[PDB]
Every structure is written in C-alpha cells, then in structure tokens.
Paper text:
Mature CVB1 virions, like other enteroviruses, have 4 structural proteins termed viral protein 1–4 (VP1–4). They form an icosahedrally-symmetric capsid of about 30 nm in diameter with VP1 around the 5-fold, VP2 on the sides of the 2-fold and alternating VP2 and VP3 around 3-fold symmetry axes. At the base of VP1, there is a hydrophobic pocket which normally contains a lipid factor. Similar to empty particles, recombinantly produced Virus-Like Particles (VLPs) closely mimic the structure of infectious virions but lack genetic material.
Through cryoEM and single-particle image processing, two distinct particle populations were separated. These particle populations were termed compact and expanded, structurally corresponding to mature native CVB1 virions and CVB1 A-particles respectively. Particle sets were processed in cryoEM and Scipion to 2.15 Å resolution reaching Nyqvist. The structure and position of VP0 in VLPs corresponds to VP2 and VP4 in mature virions, however lacking a 39 residues long section on the inside of the capsid and missing an N-terminus and myristoyl group. Furthermore, N-terminus arms embracing the VP4 in the native CVB1 could not be modelled prior to residue 56 in the CVB1-VLPTween80. Other characteristic structural features of native CVB1 are seen, such as the VP1 around the 5-fold, lipid factor inside the hydrophobic pocket, VP0 helices on the sides of the 2-fold symmetry axis and VP0 and VP3 alternating around a 3-fold. At the current resolution, an ion coordinated between three D203 at the 3-fold can be observed in both expanded and compact forms. In the expanded CVB1-VLPsTween80, a forked density is present above cysteins which could be additional ion densities and in the compact CVB1-VLPTween80 two conformations of VP3 R232 are resolved. Here we observed two structural differences of CVB1-VLPsTween80 compared to native CVB1 which are the presence of a VP3 loop in the pore of the expanded CVB1-VLPsTween80 and an additional density in the interprotomer pocket of compact CVB1-VLPTween80. Despite the lower immunizing properties, VLPs have shown to be stable for at least one month and can handle freezing and thawing while retaining almost 50% of the particles in the compact form.
Residue numbers in the entry:
A (entry chain 3): 1 to 238
B (entry chain 4), I (entry chain 4), J (entry chain 4), K (entry chain 4), L (entry chain 4): 27 to 43
C (entry chain 2): 13 to 263
D (entry chain 1), E (entry chain 1), G (entry chain 1): 56 to 278
F (entry chain 3), H (entry chain 3): 1 to 60
C-alpha cells in the first residue's frame, strides 16, 4: 500500500475534535424539516434578553419575589443610597443567576457593555429623581452622592419616565475579563442615590418598589467554553 | 484533506463550523 | 382608540398599546408542504376565531399568581370546544388579552407571560401531578407564596419563585411576555403562534401553551381607594384548524 | 471587532459528553449490560440541552471501554486481548436474554465489534425522530384520557443498547465498563427556555425541590 | 415526499450477519475446525434470503476471532500473541487432516493469516455460482431417478473453510472461536416468496411443524 | 511515508459500514447474467401486494 | 553567505520541552492528579521564555504517560491495557474531588482519552490571553492598594489539568506518571531582556541569591 | 479503505518534529493583536547589542 | 476519498447506494 | 502532502518555517 | 488509489492483471 | 505517492536514485 507514518495523537479521543465517522443507519430518510418559531443561532441572543435582577438578595428574600423588589420611599433627608452592588456579572449573587449570568457561567472570559433597566412601580401620582452611577475601580465604592456623581452617571426622573435604560460602558485595561472573581479584572460598582426625593400627595402610599433588569448589549461576547458550576450530581438519575 | 466528504450520508459529515 | 375585531367580538386598547407578537411570527394556517394528515381540514373561522372571556380573578394584596393551560381553558367555549371534541387533531394560535384597571392612586406590577410546553413538577418527587392540579379549565390555578409539602401525593409544586418548573421566576422574560404596571398600563396583549414539534396535535392530551400572571410588585393602595381590583383574561383562537372528524370524545 | 463564534449553538453543543456507563462481568450467562437510550440521566448534558424546547441534530457516538481483572484462585492467569460487541435494538426487536443468545447474530440490527487496546469505536447517527424535531419538554400525557404517564417520558421510544464480551471466559473473571459519549452535530434549536435552577431529581420528569433564586448577601448595599 | 431508500433490497440485505462460529483448541493434532459453507444454519439471515426464490450478489466476508485461556498446571503461563490461518478449500481439493498437515501450504487455495489484537480480517467474494443465479429453493432431486436427496441441498457445493492456530502450543492450552459474518453486496433478487412463518427445523430442507397463521384474540370485534 | 493520524473508530467492525475489501478470487469470470421474471427492487413492492387478512383470528 | 535561520525566534522556541510531570495511583478514591498550568516550574523553558518581556504564541501540547506495577499480594496479576483521561478545567469550572466524580462527564470541558501502547496524545491550543500578549514579567500588584501579591503571579489564571485512570482497579495497584510537553508555535516576541544569571529559586517570583557576573581567572592577562 | 503501509518512525514523538494537531478549542476568538515596541525576530539581533565585558574577572 | 475504486475486481467495490 | 491544512483552526497549523 | 506506483523499482509493482 | 516531499528540509528526502 501507500507508505504512511503515524504521528502523535493517533488513536486519541479528544472530546472537542471534529472528524467524520461512519453512519450506523445508511440511507436513513429523515423526517422533513418544519418551520418552528423562535429559532436560536447564538447563546448571545439569550444573553441579550432582559431578566429581572434580584438586587434585594438578602437571606429572607431569596425564597420569594421580594428578592427582586428595591424599596423606595419619601425621606426626611437628602442623598441617601438606594442600592449598590459590584459589576461582577458572572461571580456576584446579584447578577449570577439572571439569563446573562447563566450564559456567562458556561464561559471563562467576557467583554462588552451591560444594559441595566430600572422600572418604577409606584403610583402614577408619585414623583422623584434618582442618580444612577457607575464607578470604575481603583478607588472604593462611592460612599455618598458627591463621590458617586464624579463618575459616569445619569439622572432618572420617575415623574417623566417609568423606565430608565442605563448602558454601562466597557472600561477595562484588558480586552476581556474573567467570569470568575479576580481582582486583576475588577469592573467597578453600580450605585443608586436619591437625587431629590420621593414626593406623593395625600392618600398615596409613600413606599414604592423598583424592578431592575439586566441584559447584554450589542458588543457582548464570551470565550473559552467550560462546564457550569451550577449543576452537579452524585449518581445517575433513575 | 482540506474538506472532502468520505461517506455517502450527511450525518457522517463533521460539524458545521 | 385602537379596536381589534375578531368575528362578532371587539376589544379596545390604547393606540400605542404595543401588542407583543410571540416570537415575531403571526399565526397562520398550516401549509400543504408541511402537512402530514391527508383529510381535508375544518376551518370554522368566525364561529371559533373570536374573543372568549374567562372568569375573572381578584388581585389581592397577598396574591402569588395564576395560570391557565391554553387549549384546556377554552375546551368549554362555544363551537371551539365542540370542534375540539369532534376532531382528533387540531392546531391554533391565540390572541391573549389581559385586562386590569385601577386608579392613578393604586400601585402594582404584573408579569403576563406565555410559556410553551410548561411541564410542571410535582410536590411528591416520585409522582407526577394529576390533571385537576395541572389545569382547571376556565377556572385559574393559583401559585403559592409557600412551598407545598411532600406529603401531598399528586399536587403541583406551586412555589412562585420557581414557577412550578424548577427555574428562576425572574428569568421567565425569555418567553413572550408583557408587563402590566398600574402606573402606566391597564392591559396586555400577546399574540402567539402555534408552537410544537409536529404540525398538528391532539388538543386534549397536550397543552401547548400556559399563560402565567405573576405579581412581581404587590398591589397596594391607601385607605379609601377601591380595594377590589379584578383581572380579566380574554382569549381568541387564531387560524384554528382541525382534522380527523369522528364521534365526540367524552372528555 | 469581537466575534461570537464560540457562543454558537454548534460550538456550545458539539462537545462529547458522557451520558451513561454500564458494567458487565464475564463470569455468568447474565454477563451482559443494557441501557435504554436517553439524555436525562446526566446533569450536564441534560442542562445544556434543556436550554431549548425543541432540538434537531445528528449524533456522533463514541464508546470508551475499559476492563479490570477480578479476583481469581487459578495460578498464572494469562488472558488474551478482549473483544466486545455493542448491539442496538430498535423498539419491537428481539432482545438478548443471555450472553450466548441467538439475538447477537445482529443480521439486521446495527452492531460494532471492538478489541481492547485500539482507538475508541465511533459511529454517526442521523435525526431519527418520528416528529419534525426532538422534544426536551412535553406538557401532556400519553393516554387520551389524561391518566397515567405525564411528561417528557411519553416521547422516549429510542431503543436499547446491549453490550457483552465476545470472548469465552478464561481462568479469571474480567469486569468491563463501557462509557457512552454523545456529541450533537448540525444542531438546530428553537424556543429558548430559562436555565435549570433547582437540582435535578428524576430522569423521567421535571420534579424539583424549591430553592432560592440566588445566593445571598448581607444588605442591599453590600459590595 | 417520503423516500423508500431503506426498503431497497441492497439496504435490506447489505448488513453483516453471523452465519456460523466454530471452535478449536491448540492442545491436539486434531486442533483445527471445519465448516461446510451454507447460509441455512442461522435463522435470521436465512429468513431474510428466503423472501426471494433466486438471488445474485457479491459477498463480503468478515471474521471475528477470539481466544480464551484453558486450565493449565504450569506456573507462570506467558503466551505470545496468537496468529490464525483460515483456508478455503474448493470442492475436490485436498483437505487437512491435522494441524501440521501439508495442505496448509495453500499454494493455490486462498488463505488469510491474521494476528490477534488487530482489526478483523475481511475479504470480498464474487458471484461464484455455476448457474445464472443462486437458488434459495429447489423443488427437485439430485438423481435422475427421483430417488435419494430431495430439495435445496442438491445445489450446495460451495466448499469448506478450515481454521487452525499457526503458533505452536505453549505452556497452556488456548481455545479460540471464529465467528463468520456474511454481507451480500450488489444484490439482485427475483420471484418474491411468502415470509417463513413456521420455525425452522433442519438445515438441508424446508421441514416444519404446522403452526397457526396468527396470534389470537377473543372475538371478531375485540379491539 | 506520508504523515497520518488515526482517529477514533479505527480497527472497529461496524456491521452497517460500507467499505471496499480485497477480493479473494482475482479475475474470477462470473456466469453471464440471464433475464429472470419477477425482479424485485424494493420491499415496498412486496408490501403493496394484497394478502388475505385473518380477521376471524379466534383460538379455534 | 551564512544564513541565520536557526537563530529565529520560531526555531529557538519551537522545540518540545517538559514543563511538569505528575503521578497518580489506582489504589484510592483520591487517585487523581492536578496541576495548575504555568511555565515557571522548569528551569530551561522558563529561561528560554524569559529572554523576552512579552510573548504571543500558539501552543502544541503532548503528553507522555507511563505506568509501573506496584507491589501486590495477589497471585497471578494480569492487568488489561490502561486507559487514561486528562481533563482541562478553565477557572471557575467545577473541579473533581475523587476518581469517580461527576465532573469527569466533561460535557463542556475539553478532555482527551488515551490508551497505553499508542502514540502520545497531542492537541493544539491558540493564544488564550485576555491581554494582547502573554507577560513574562509584571512589575506591579494585583490589588489597587499595592498590598498583597506582587509580581508575575497576578497574571496567572490559566486553569488546571486533571488526570486519572479510567479503568477500575484490578488485583494490583498501578502507578502512572504523565509528562507534559509544551511547544510554542507561531511565536511573536517583544522587548528582549538580559538572560537569567542567578539560579531560579521560586515559581511565582524572580527571587534570587546574588552570584558573580562570570567565572574567574587568575589575572587580567591570563590566557 | 485505501491500502497503506506504515513506515519506521510511526507513533514516535520527536521533540523537533513539525506536524499539525487538532485544536482543543475550536473557533476560539483570539484577542486582537496590538503594536508593541521592540519586536524581535532573530536571536542574532540580541547578539548584536553591545554589552559590557568583564575583562578584570579576578576572584575579588 | 469521495469515490475511487482501489481494486481491479468489481466484487471489491462498496455497496450500490 | 507538501502543504495542506487539515484543520479549520489556525492554531492547528505547523510552525512558521 | 486506482493505479500509482509508489516505488522506483519495477519489481515493487503489483501483478500484471 | 510517485514523488512528493512531505518535509521542508532537504535531509528528509529519500535517496538519490
Ligand atoms: C452499534 C450501533 C449503535 C447505534 C445507536 C443508536 C442511538 C439512537 C439515537 C439516540 C438519539 C437521542 C436523541 C435525544 C432526544 C432528546 O433530546 O430528548
Ligand atoms: C480465506 C478466503 C476465504 C474464501 C471464502 C469463500 C466463500 C465461498 C462463497 C459462498 C457463497 C454462498 C452463497 C449462498 C447461496 C444461497 O443463498 O443459497
Ligand atoms: C485535554 C485538553 C487540554 C487543554 C490544555 C489547555 C492549556 C492552557 C494553555 C496554557 C498557556 C500557557 C501560556 C504561558 C504564558 C507565559 O509565558 O507566562
């Protein structure tokens, strides 16, 4: 026969190889294809769908819908903090289990802007202004509205808009950040502050709630497929 | 080689990449 | 401002109501090139493609949520149910219209979501839920803010935060959905096509769709405001088709 | 300027995953193994598939077969290389009941014979569903009366794999384990679904025990 | 819109089927095996072939050879890899009578030598009938007087296979089994015949014991 | 020789494979083909022939 | 008239070098091995790489796996050929804690199965840094407060390799050693740096003990 | 299959060989290349840079 | 390859599909 | 052969010589 | 392949058929 | 095949015959 020489890697079974193999059912006639709605071609399409963020992830709220409710009320002071969490979409509990966070945990590196949407769910009679800020790392988390407003921020008026869409820009020294927590690739902090106050008429509940949504923007990408740490097993399922 | 199907069945082909 | 007429029934919405269309696909009749049944289909049109209003439910301050299984919920509605009984196969889309009005002094937010193939889990791990627990026809089945005990042999695990499917409730937005925020909206309209792995199916043995309404922000109001806030669901079959005409099934 | 190639459905699913493994010993007439084919007995591949409601793909099958020497009393055990047979029995076909069963003639059933020490056996399988797509979830029953079996198990009629030692037993028993690996290729997916949050409990249904939506932190401002 | 590709005669018959297996041990001069080639000793392939009256095909031959260590009294049995010889003897040719027979020179007889641990040996055979087609059934006799042998066996003159261990026996006996697999290719079939209903009884004839036409049900309206 | 790398499936015997193999009888001269009535090309041709149905399949 | 082909960066670095080797025995549930991937545990390849400050290359991975029989008390140990599994776990992925761990399903993690007696397994790896080049030296800290870890180790987040015996343990323990070989290909190098003079002391830093600049001679005129 | 014959050197691992191997990370999207000063293409470039000679290499 | 006969005898060819 | 890439990834190629 | 001599010597060729 | 160099180095070539 033709002279050949076998190289290293012969007879190996690499789980990510791409080779042809003989068919066990020659000339099998497959069922005709049928148009089904909702075809998906890339996991980024799933990652780009807004999902409700459990910002209130206290131990007493994770087993109910209170985890998604951000309290807000009329205060007697100024510049109080509403919430604050690190921008760790793949490692922080706040964003870990959303659609974006679940897609991220199948990968090792990520890059791109993050779309944050806040919808005010109080009465139509309520008014108020909020300061939503993103602080790049290097310093700590901002501790007051003065520190928060020195970075990227927007002013949200619930009286004018029931939904504010804040797109957190990608500001990093590297092209990609690790999905797991790593200080070398810290992404910063997201905080919200009272710009003026919640103001309501008589016979209106002063305590209201805000819902936060998260999704990837158009420039988002992931790399280095891996097994997720969210599913595990001890024996085969019978 | 670069790309040649060695089998008569489409299921034998490598992945779509 | 905007009126939607189907058959002899009409509903009205704001001119900017933003109707949500499924996965971007409008309901349509089955094409010949993708049909497998050979008998001529029955298309009742005006007699079945009309708005049917189910029984209203009350949005309470402690309400956890409700769900309806779509083909079953209309099994007793006029000629649609009669055709379901008299035909072996059927396919249809839906136009789901959810109505909940409240004053400007009320607050609350609902998630209206249509879930295809919403297979539900049982409170007893070794069993599967029974039909009565999985669906109540017109009557709505209620989610629970607590966890159903394992003692119950054939009940649905109705914990809201897992939505009876062992998933994250906040991730339900991946399915076609709309938000009813009392501050801005009083209705939601979702048009869903026929979604299945086969062109036609039996309407009694398979529930293709499940409509869930889950209050993410609880209803609240001050003393003096009207305490009774109903939620009314109106569903219209779209492009309903039937095959295999025979004697009527008992169920 | 950043490509999304590695987040394609193909790249996401076109990786070989163990779906089951079975064992059989050469010391009895019942020394064969069987497995009803399903993708729901392993957590990882099941979760990856259940991100979607309907799937359509071809399948690459790879088997990793290893053997271990069992205790024996004979002096000087010297066994030749072992040959294995794996036979696929579609539903309705006769099934073996012993190692020396006539059904192993595999005149029409597809079978593969493989000897230890070589590269793992591998074959391709087309899309063999009676429907237009595989179903990951089925909100329905098998009986028209809505009694009996409920769920995805109604649609599982994919057949059974049978495995045995071809060689006749020698002076010492040999126990073999066969690991089955599935690799979907030419994948098409529809109707994305929320990722599974609660841990899996059973193979044939979606039963779960309620679990919190996320892990917790001390307060709403904790960083 | 539905193709009938998998119901072709080719696809129906072009699947490897075991037709026989023989054993031989290396502990005697009579330690060889023989088999008169025929397709009527196994139920499955015989039934598949007997759907037709006349057939014309090429044949692919594949052998699966496995060995087992036999009991021995010598300490530390360490046997080298075994080499086997399979020789085809057409009718009229000299036949071996012992392992060390001169007939194994195979100067003109086709033979194959194969060592354990490798891929199964395989060879192709053309259509070798003296007639224009193979016959599955023969309603006639071999003698012009209509006495003696009656049936299909009159036409079976296909020869004999002989199998032996090439290696000289060591410190422990080795028993080997060779499984013979037939795969018809380029098949042509004529005169379809009713599928065999009664179970087979003998190799050389169509003898049967009467059996009911179908399984039974209670009444003519039972569903 | 030419560098090659063996992949999984090497040396396996799959009963439904389709490969070429050496002929054990080189240059064998086959008997000429003869026209025989009743050529069958597909089992569906057999399945399309009417057969009597045992509808009265009682035990007796 | 003299070419400098063999002093190219490619030829200088495109030679396989052992970077580590690990051992594991089949006699315990903890009978697996792990290694956090890094190129700083061996003197030769580390020195060759550290002639430059930044590097960008693809990598060819080759494993040399050998086994040794451990002492046993069973008479007539006869073990079949051994199959090994090597799994790569990117940072954040679940890690195995025992030989029979569920993590070895490798549904998404890349893994290679290899049987003893064959050619060494080999795979290629692209440039997988989050930066635009690999860094051999890093004059900085991991924390913004300039406390804690200082040096090149801050940038090492390349993952972990896991190795185990696939075969179930037999009548005698087997100890295996896997040698890992790195071969950079398609190399690009920047900012040449003085060759390392003092002997290496630690993996994660550049710590050294002062040594003379050269060897000595008696006087300034000694030849 | 196609008839082949394996030559000496088969299955060997020579550290200075030059062959192709399967990628363990198909379709991996590498970080874009960035211009860095001081690109080196040959070790002779390093060898051509003047360095101070320790001519007085006495033990002290 | 795609389809090339490696042998001089027709019986050596693969199946007719 | 002389030079043909057998894989779809650039990292699979041999060295640059 | 169909017919290509792999060796430089005529004695290496296959049989004349 | 008939004659194709598989390696980039002249020393890898077969003998001069
Ligand atoms: C020796 C030949 C082996 C042949 C094995 C045939 C295997 C049958 C194919 C199984 C397909 C499984 C599809 C899973 C569907 C789902 O996602 O629920
Ligand atoms: C080592 C070389 C082996 C050669 C073996 C030659 C086998 C002879 C061919 C047998 C053809 C059998 C045809 C069956 C006819 C029938 O259907 O009755
Ligand atoms: C079975 C699959 C094995 C996959 C192994 C992947 C190995 C990861 C790649 C490591 C690159 C190391 C780069 C060194 C950087 C430096 O010079 O500091």
């Amino acid at each position: 026969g033709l002279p050949v020489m076998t190289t290293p890697g012969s007879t190996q079974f690499l789980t990510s190889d791409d080779f042809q193999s003989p068919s066990a059912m020659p000339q099998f006639d497959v069922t005709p294809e049928m148009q089904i709605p909702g075809r998906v071609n890339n996991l980024m399409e799933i990652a780009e769908v807004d999902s409700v963020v459990p910002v209130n992830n206290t131990e007493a709220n994770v087993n109910s819908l209170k985890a998604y409710q951000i309290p807000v009320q009329s205060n007697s002071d100024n510049g109080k903090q509403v919430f604050g969490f690190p921008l760790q979409p793949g490692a922080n509990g706040v964003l870990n289990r959303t659609l974006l966070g679940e897609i991220l945990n199948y990968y090792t590196h990520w890059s791109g802007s993050i779309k944050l949407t806040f919808m005010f769910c109080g009465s139509a009679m309520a008014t108020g202004k909020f300061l939503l800020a993103y602080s790049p790392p290097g310093a700590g988390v901002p501790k007051n509205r003065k520190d928060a407003m020195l970075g990227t921020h927007v002013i949200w008026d619930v009286g004018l808009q029931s939904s504010c869409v804040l797109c957190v820009p990608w500001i990093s020294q590297t092209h990609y950040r690790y999905v797991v927590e790593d200080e070398y690739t810290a992404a910063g902090y997201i905080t919200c502050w009272y710009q003026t106050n919640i103001v309501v008429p008589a016979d209106v509940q002063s305590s209201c709630d805000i819902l936060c949504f998260v999704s990837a923007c158009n420039d988002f990408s992931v790399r280095m497929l891996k097994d997720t740490p969210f599913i595990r097993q001890d024996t085969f399922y019978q | 080689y670069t790309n040649i199907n060695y089998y008569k069945d489409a299921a034998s082909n490598s992945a779509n990449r | 401002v905007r009126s939607i007429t189907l058959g002899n029934s009409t509903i009205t919405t704001q001119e900017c109501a933003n109707v949500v269309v499924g996965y971007g696909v409008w309901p349509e009749y089955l094409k010949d090139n993708e049909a497998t049944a050979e008998d001529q289909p029955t298309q009742p049109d005006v007699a079945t493609c009309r708005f049917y209003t189910l029984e209203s439910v009350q949005w309470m301050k402690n309400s956890a949520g409700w769900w309806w299984k779509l083909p079953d919920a209309l099994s007793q509605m006029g000629l649609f149910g009669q055709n379901m009984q008299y035909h072996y196969l059927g396919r249809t889309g839906y136009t789901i219209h959810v109505q909940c009005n409240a004053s400007k002094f009320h607050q609350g937010c609902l998630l209206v979501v249509c879930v295809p193939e919403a297979e539900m889990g049982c409170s007893n791990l070794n069993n599967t839920p029974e039909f009565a627990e999985l669906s109540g026809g017109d009557t709505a089945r209620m989610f629970t803010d607590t966890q159903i005990g394992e003692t119950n042999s054939k009940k649905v695990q109705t914990a809201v935060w897992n939505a009876g499917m062992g998933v994250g409730v906040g991730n339900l937005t991946i399915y076609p959905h709309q938000w009813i925020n009392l501050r801005t909206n009083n209705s939601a309209t979702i048009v869903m096509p026929y979604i299945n792995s086969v062109p036609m199916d039996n309407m009694f043995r398979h529930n293709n769709l499940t409509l869930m309404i889950i209050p993410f922000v609880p209803l609240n109001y001050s003393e003096g405001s009207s305490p009774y806030v109903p939620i009314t669901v109106t569903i219209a079959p779209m492009c309903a088709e039937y095959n295999g005409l025979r004697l009527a099934s008992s169920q | 300027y950043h490509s999304r190639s590695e987040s394609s459905i193909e790249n996401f699913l076109c990786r070989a995953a163990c779906v089951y493994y079975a064992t059989y010993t050469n010391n009895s007439e019942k020394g064969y193994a069987e497995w009803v084919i399903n993708t729901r007995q392993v957590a990882q591949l099941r979760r990856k598939l259940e991100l979607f409601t309907y799937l359509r793909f071809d399948l690459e099958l790879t088997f990793v077969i290893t053997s271990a020497q069992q205790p024996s009393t004979a002096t000087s055990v010297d066994a030749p290389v072992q040959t294995h047979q794996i036979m696929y029995v579609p539903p309705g076909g006769p099934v073996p009941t012993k190692v020396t069963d006539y059904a192993w003639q595999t005149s029409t059933n597809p079978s593969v014979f493989w000897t230890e020490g070589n590269a793992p056996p591998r074959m391709s399988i087309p899309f063999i569903s009676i429907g237009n797509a595989y179903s990951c979830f089925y909100d329905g029953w098998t009986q028209f009366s809505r009694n009996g079996v409920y769920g995805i198990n109604t649609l599982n009629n994919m057949g059974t794999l049978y495995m045995r030692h071809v060689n006749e037993a020698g002076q010492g028993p040999i126990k073999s384990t066969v690991r089955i690996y599935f690799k979907p290729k030419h994948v098409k997916a529809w109707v994305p679904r929320p990722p599974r949050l609660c841990q899996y409990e059973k193979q044939k249904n979606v039963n779960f025990t309620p679990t919190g939506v996320t892990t917790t932190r001390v307060g709403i401002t904790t960083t």
